[PDB]
């Protein structure tokens, strides 16, 4: 150009520098891998997020448990108050005797909410009622009320957690539930490559109004629990979400991976309540591996055009830190093999 | 009891409907049947700004009719000089999931927000020579849909938790909250004199709010789906909406009723954005079938097509002096029509 003034050339060259930096930044992050989590409530997304951070980045320092003490205290007090509300919710009488008056007094005392440390009297009453046969039976009696599944862990270690000189550990911080509004993302370096994974939880709104923002992600991970096959059922709603996610017109080319959490809980509880409650059409024996294969079979048949895409399934136990690493190694191996370009 | 309240609400609905119907003697079409038609409107492409690397979700014109801002999903805000197609600033964001942007009427600030439930305000004129975050406003419990400056010190936001709010940028607390509403607020438009505004949601209704008190004055239930776009008429006595049922509609404040429905056959896609001309004669609307139609605002006839995009047109704006129209789309291009 020749008509350009003295100042305009500086503007043009600054625009060129901006273009160069923008191009460099754009192509720098165009080679990474983006995973995305979905599912229903209490499926276990945050658990595997914390597991991923523990494994592939670094551990947790001792100071983290200092601030997680408040949330674990809140979780265990909520669990015990839910238990003592549930024992009278069905009006099931128990052999409490003096423990009934103790329960009434501690229900009154539950409004303290100091969140610093339990009362020694409170801990003692909780301990002595925990030995009552009636409330113990009620704890496993009716799988109707929304009871946290970590209550069997938190209330079985009151002789350590309730002491003033108590600090949480990795196991304690892993089994800690919290509902936080907003998107959660975590990025880390693995296999000489950068991974970014999201967690769209707490977006209590219409999902179809923003799902198109994630068009063309590298992979989608679906988390489906198994221990909730007779909880008010929920597995039918999980399938009624899966058929909508899988048959989407946006996720035509994206490998879908299934995680089946809570496999140990399923193994424990499969010997009590038969699978016929959730699926009336089942007719096999009450054994573990056949029931799991049945779940897989009636959970895979919701995919149209199975020739084009195939879903990848694993049996993980996200609380256990050992079995997440191997499963993630397998899934990153298959996503690398499926992305040869 | 509850049932008596349901009958009271039904009788009130019948009374409001009858009072609106009782004052609808003549239609807008019969009165404006003798107006001469506009003719044919042919707009060419003047600019093809190409600097984004992902889908473009929002844009806004500056009040001096020369600068504009655009937001995209690669995590960048870019300020453009439309006369020379130069880039003035490029601002990286802390969250890449952005759905809206706004420009201050003075030119000093820029707003942004998205799936992080946070609205971020950026200062454009500082001694250090780089754009830095001035404040972050938090308190919504759902993704942020739209935001519009009222002043250099006040801003109005809407979110998917069925609420709107009015902010004080120095102080981190909401000054007014708007809660009577049932669906999800998706779009928002400020009046020219900045005392009222309208909001359109996915419960197929629109509401007129008063800023000073924060009360709803009128409610319009005429569409059959989600409402996706909204704009106020320049006169200040009417507004227009655009929805997912492939139909735009014009509502009138003073008569509190509906005047016209702008629909044509063979069109089965939704509308993403809507805007008026300076004299209120042409209405511009963007569709999912990759085109953009221009409507004669008094006669339901179609007066042209703008057909220069390769994907769905998502944002659209008209300058203050009315010299050009800018459209953005998911194919990562901006075009200037005149």
């Amino acid at each position: 150009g020749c008509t350009l003034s003295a100042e305009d050339k500086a503007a043009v060259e600054r625009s060129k520098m901006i273009d160069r930096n923008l191009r460099e930044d754009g192509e720098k992050a165009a080679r990474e891998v983006k995973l995305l989590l979905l599912g229903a409530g209490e499926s276990g997304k945050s658990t595997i997020v914390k597991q991923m951070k523990i494994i592939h980045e670094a551990g947790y320092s001792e100071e983290e448990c200092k601030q997680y003490k408040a949330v674990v205290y809140s979780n265990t007090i909520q669990s015990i108050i839910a238990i003592i509300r549930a024992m009278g919710r069905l009006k099931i009488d128990f052999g409490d005797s003096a423990r009934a008056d103790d329960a009434r007094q501690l229900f009154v005392l539950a409004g303290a909410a100091e969140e610093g440390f339990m009362t020694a009297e409170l801990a003692g009453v909780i301990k002595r009622l925990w030995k009552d046969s009636g409330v113990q039976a009620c704890f496993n009696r009716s799988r109707e009320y929304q009871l946290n599944d970590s209550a069997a862990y938190y209330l079985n270690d009151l002789d350590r957690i309730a002491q003033p000189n108590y600090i949480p550990t990795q196991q304690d911080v892993l089994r800690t539930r919290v509902k936080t509004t907003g998107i959660v993302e975590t990025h880390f370096t693995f296999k000489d490559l950068h991974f970014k994974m999201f967690d769209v939880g707490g977006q209590r709104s219409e999902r179809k109004k923003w799902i198109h923002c994630f068009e063309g992600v590298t992979a989608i991970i679906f988390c489906v629990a198994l221990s909730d096959y007779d909880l008010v059922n929920r597995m039918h709603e999980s399938m009624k979400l899966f058929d909508s996610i899988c048959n989407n017109k946006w996720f035509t080319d994206t490998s879908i991976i299934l995680f089946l959490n809570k496999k140990d809980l399923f193994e424990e509880k499969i010997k009590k309540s038969p699978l016929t409650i959730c699926y009336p059409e089942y007719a096999g024996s009450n054994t573990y591996e056949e029931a799991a294969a049945y779940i897989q079979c009636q959970f895979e048949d919701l995919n149209k055009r199975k020739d084009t895409k195939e879903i990848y399934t694993h049996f993980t136990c996200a609380t256990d830190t050992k079995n997440v690493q191997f499963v993630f190694d397998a899934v990153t191996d298959v996503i690398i093999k499926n992305n040869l370009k | 009891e509850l049932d008596q309240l349901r009958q009271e609400a039904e009788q009130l609905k019948n009374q409001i409907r009858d009072a609106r119907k009782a004052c609808a003697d003549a239609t807008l079409s019969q009165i404006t049947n003798n107006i001469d038609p506009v003719g044919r409107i042919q707009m060419r492409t003047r600019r093809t700004l190409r600097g984004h690397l992902a889908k473009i979700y929002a844009m806004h014109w500056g009040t001096d009719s020369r600068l504009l801002v655009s937001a995209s999903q690669d995590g960048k805000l870019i300020i453009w000089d439309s006369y020379t197609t130069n880039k003035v600033h490029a601002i990286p964001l802390r969250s890449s999931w952005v759905m809206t942007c706004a420009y201050a009427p003075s030119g000093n600030y820029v707003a942004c927000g998205g799936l992080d439930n946070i609205c971020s305000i950026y200062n454009l004129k500082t001694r250090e020579g780089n754009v830095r975050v001035s404040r972050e406003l938090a308190g919504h419990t759902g993704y942020l849909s739209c935001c519009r400056f009222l002043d250099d010190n006040q801003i109005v936001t809407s979110s998917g938790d069925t609420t709107c709010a009015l902010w004080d940028i120095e102080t981190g607390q909401q000054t007014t909250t708007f809660t009577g509403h049932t669906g999800d607020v998706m779009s928002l438009s400020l009046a020219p004199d900045t005392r009222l505004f309208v909001s359109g949601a996915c419960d197929a209704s629109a509401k007129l709010w008063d800023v000073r008190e924060g009360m709803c004055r009128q409610t319009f239930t005429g569409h059959e789906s989600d409402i996706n776009a909204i704009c106020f008429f320049p006169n200040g006595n009417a507004f227009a909406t655009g929805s997912d049922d492939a139909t735009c509609r014009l509502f009138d404040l003073r008569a509190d009723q509906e005047l016209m429905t702008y629909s044509h056959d063979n069109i089965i896609c939704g509308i993403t954005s809507v805007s008026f001309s300076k004299s209120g004669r042409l209405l511009l609307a963007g569709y999912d079938d990759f085109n953009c139609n221009v409507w004669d605002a008094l006669k339901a006839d179609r007066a042209g097509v703008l057909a220069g995009h390769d994907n769905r047109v998502s944002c659209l704006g008209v300058t203050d002096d009315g010299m050009a129209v800018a459209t953005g789309s998911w194919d990562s291009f901006l075009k200037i029509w005149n």
Partner: single-chain antibody, 233 residues
């Protein structure tokens, strides 16, 4: 805050060499273009050299071409000037000025301090009617600066700048492109005028505003100053 601190300079034997450095602190150094501006023990200012951002464009004055060299080191936030074959006409005081160019910016806004160098033992012409105009506090005055070639470009802008230097301080930007008031400057200053005839008007003149006023053109390189007009009580 924004700061530019200078060091170096001293007595030099003629024909020798020296180097001056300009260290910045308080702003994003790598996004600005830098200028070197020289003065004289009694004469006016004269532009010397200019380095862009990213070091992609270099200009030199007509009398120092082929001897002086300008450079920058972005990571350490330093600006360098290498000076060779020092002639006796280079005895001066050197200033380091920052400027940024985009739509609506204000170049030449911070000047910093100087360093003293003692070497001793087609251009547009701007005329500023150099003389002392006596003033008294309370009244209003006008200052004129006529050009030789019209400064109005075809894009509508007219590139004229006005500077004020109080006694024993560094120069300060007042008006850029004849009408726009710089940041932090009281609204008592007004600028107007047509092509090749410009005026600066001060109304209700206050105190501490005594000094020398300079007019500068930024239409095309090399940049040229005026002789400078003096205001005294």
């Amino acid at each position: 805050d924004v700061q530019l601190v200078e060091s170096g300079g001293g007595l030099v034997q003629p024909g020798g060499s020296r180097k001056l450095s300009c260290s910045a602190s308080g702003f994003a150094f790598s996004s600005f273009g830098m200028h070197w501006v020289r003065q004289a023990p009694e004469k006016g200012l004269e532009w010397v050299a200019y380095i862009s951002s990213g070091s992609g464009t270099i200009y030199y004055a007509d009398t120092v071409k082929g001897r002086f060299t300008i450079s920058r080191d972005d990571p350490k936030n330093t600006l360098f000037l290498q000076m060779t074959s020092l002639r006796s006409e280079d005895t001066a005081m050197y200033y380091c000025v920052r400027s940024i160019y985009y739509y609506g910016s204000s170049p030449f806004d911070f000047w910093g301090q100087g360093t003293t160098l003692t070497v001793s033992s087609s251009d547009i012409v701007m005329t500023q009617a150099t003389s002392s105009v006596p003033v008294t506090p309370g009244e209003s005055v006008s200052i004129s600066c006529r050009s030789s070639k019209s400064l109005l470009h075809s894009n509508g802008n007219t590139y004229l700048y006005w500077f004020l230097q109080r006694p024993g301080q560094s120069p300060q930007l007042l008006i850029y492109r004849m009408s726009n008031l710089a940041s932090g400057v009281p609204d008592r200053f007004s600028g107007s005028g047509s092509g090749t005839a410009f005026t600066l008007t001060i109304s209700r003149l206050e105190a501490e505003d005594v000094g020398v006023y300079y007019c500068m053109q930024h239409l095309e390189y090399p940049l040229t100053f005026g002789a400078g007009t003096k205001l005294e009580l």
